[PDB]
């Protein structure tokens, strides 16, 4: 009797970090993969996703 | 109208109206532009013309 919002994540317990997926923020997000080439320090996230 | 030293005889005249700069011309405040480089080096038009 309090809950506030109830999202529908992506069951963090299944997509364990044994699938290199850091899922907190909301969306999946593997680290080094289809990374873009020739860009500043950041930029490696619009598609890290 | 008048002779015009040079375009006339040779009487080296000794007195002229020299126009000069009111005060030093190169005193500090050297121009300085900020530079932004494209952030992708892969999406750089280059085409046309």
Curated annotation (Swiss-Prot), chain A:
Belongs to the turreted BTV-fold inner capsid family. It comes from Bombyx mori cytoplasmic polyhedrosis virus (BmCPV). It is found in: Virion. The chain holds residues 199 to 247 of 1333 of the full protein. Signal peptide: none annotated. This is Inner capsid protein VP1. Homodecamer; each decamer is made up of two conformers of VP2, called VP2A and VP2B. 12 homodecamers assemble to form an icosahedral capsid. Inner capsid protein that self-assembles to form an icosahedral capsid with a T=2 symmetry, which consists of 120 copies of VP2, with channels at each of its five-fold vertices. This capsid constitutes the innermost concentric layer of the viral mature particle.
